[PDB]
Write an enzyme that holds these catalytic residues in place. Structure first.
Site, mmCIF file in Angstrom:
data_model
loop_
_atom_site.group_PDB
_atom_site.id
_atom_site.type_symbol
_atom_site.label_atom_id
_atom_site.label_comp_id
_atom_site.label_asym_id
_atom_site.label_seq_id
_atom_site.Cartn_x
_atom_site.Cartn_y
_atom_site.Cartn_z
ATOM 1 C CG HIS A 1 -5.237 -2.468 -0.964
ATOM 2 N ND1 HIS A 1 -4.123 -2.217 -1.775
ATOM 3 C CD2 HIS A 1 -4.964 -1.907 0.237
ATOM 4 C CE1 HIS A 1 -3.249 -1.513 -1.078
ATOM 5 N NE2 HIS A 1 -3.723 -1.319 0.132
ATOM 6 C CG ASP B 1 -5.404 -3.160 -4.765
ATOM 7 O OD1 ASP B 1 -6.064 -2.314 -4.214
ATOM 8 O OD2 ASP B 1 -4.277 -3.367 -4.377
ATOM 9 C CB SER C 1 -0.898 0.019 1.269
ATOM 10 O OG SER C 1 -2.106 0.727 1.024
#
Ligand SMILES: *[C@@H]1O[C@H](CO)[C@@H](O)[C@H](O)[C@H]1NC(C)=O
Ligand SMILES: *[C@@H]1O[C@H](CO)[C@@H](O)[C@H](O)[C@H]1NC(C)=O
Lengths: 269, 269
Positions: A258, A201, A146
């Site tokens: 994600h 994602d 991330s």
């Protein structure tokens, strides 16, 4: 399809990245064994992997993570945690670009990621240098999920060229800047960037290309679904700056996707 | 090593139980397709399955759940949501018994579970009876994970023997009352209780025997780890009231093992 050895590496650093969230190192003394809650990082636990230095809310950007020594795999690993509240972080995310000529020429990077790195750059640079001197034979790897992926990516582009290769494995990393940066990260020497994405994602889809952003090439796209196990056969290498037909499709994105990179990541059971 | 068919049933009802948390149930129209976020219930989505009735925070214990119609598998399913915040729920768990002779003479149940159910029973029976009448050939199943598993088991024991079998599949359920109640769950006809457990899950170990609780027999104990996919061979049928060597073993328990029954459950990505 990707090679098994590459697949093993992708799995291992997804776990090192997962460990930035789920390991119990708040103030763990250097030298402790790396362990995670909830089967977050079993490969890492299996290695002789200990902490070199643990950081938290560090500098301007509240950068959190750890530096690890792994004697089994012969690694120096610098792992950046992503946001502790991902959905929020996603909706609070600005698209501002900033010039980053001091990393590459005519390069524009995301303002918040470049800044947060910049503010911790010197302290961490120093700490990788030490480990590298102490274990000249070990591979240096930067990794992150991330936000952590973005950081990692910016830090690798920044600290390469200094006599040790730095490899970067990012998981679900957002875009980090302009076509010129995407190009710099595509071609730069002194290491390899492995940019891993999952299905639809949302995060590698941000900030949008319509805010001047682009993706470095290549992209390792995990096609298998959320909560599904990954095999080497579910990962497609996608070639081309902002290639589409990987994660970069105009279908509708998803948050859950994600949080599933080989295993649960960005959250702890 | 349970059969393929039983395994498929186990997996389906784990998903119906997961759907109680991750569905977009709230109160959405009756006759709406059941779907979950984050790949929480793909087998249910795959079924021609719809809500018949959804409840939120209903009555004394704020009971939450849904009643579903599944025309693909020929089921009427009552699925009860566990707690929104399991760690707090476990920390606040009360161990008091209250008598339940109207379920079975000699029986004492957990006071909060039985009272929460008691408080919605009439409405829920009426809803179930209605669906039985419209599909007299469908199999009635109550299901739940955690506190949902408790409610499903109690509703079960209370509502069985009125002309239609009720099967109960429970996932990481707490004990639900005294040895008398346990026995009765072990023998009662007109439906089979499948009480499923995972590794060292903490919730099936509460309340403790010491406070005057027993577990019905048998017990289906998933031995594969947290975040590991389950095969037929990872499930072991365990006989005997309060038998030891499935979940009921003298070691440290885990909250994460509670959140992994075939897939993610009790939390939503
Ligand atoms: C830490 O890990 C090493 C090697 O991987 C191990 O042998 C040692 O006992 C561990 N320490 C603890 C406290 O478990
Ligand atoms: C619900 O799913 C069924 C098949 O299982 C389908 O025929 C129906 O159209 C779907 N309804 C909606 C509103 O998507």
């Amino acid at each position: 399809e990707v090679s098994q050895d590459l697949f093993n590496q992708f799995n291992l650093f997804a776990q090192y990245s997962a460990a930035a969230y789920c390991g119990k190192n708040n103030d763990a003394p250097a030298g402790t064994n790396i362990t995670c809650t909830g089967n977050a990082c079993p490969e890492v636990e299996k290695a002789d992997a200990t902490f070199l230095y643990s950081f938290e809310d560090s500098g301007v950007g509240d950068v959190t993570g750890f530096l690890a020594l792994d004697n089994t795999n012969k690694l120096i690993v610098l792992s950046f945690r992503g946001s502790r509240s991902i959905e929020n972080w996603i909706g609070n995310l600005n698209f501002d670009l900033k010039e980053i000529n001091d990393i590459c020429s005519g390069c524009r990077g995301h303002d918040g990621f470049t800044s947060s790195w910049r503010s911790v750059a010197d302290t961490l640079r120093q700490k990788v240098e030490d480990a590298v001197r102490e274990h000249p034979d070990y591979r240096v790897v930067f990794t992150g999920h991330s936000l952590g992926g973005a950081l990692a990516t910016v830090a690798g582009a920044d600290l390469r060229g200094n006599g040790y290769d730095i490899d970067v494995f990012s998981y679900g990393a957002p875009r980090v800047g302009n076509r010129a940066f995407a190009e710099f990260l595509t071609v730069q020497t002194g290491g390899t960037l492995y940019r891993i994405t999952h299905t639809n994602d949302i995060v590698p889809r941000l900030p949008p290309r319509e805010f001047g952003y682009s993706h470095s090439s290549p992209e390792y796209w995990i096609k298998s679904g959320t909560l599904v196990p990954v095999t080497r056969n579910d990962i497609v290498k996608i070639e081309g700056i902002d290639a589409t037909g990987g994660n970069n499709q105009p279908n509708i994105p998803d948050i859950p996707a994600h949080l599933w990179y080989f295993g649960l990541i960005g959250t702890c059971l």
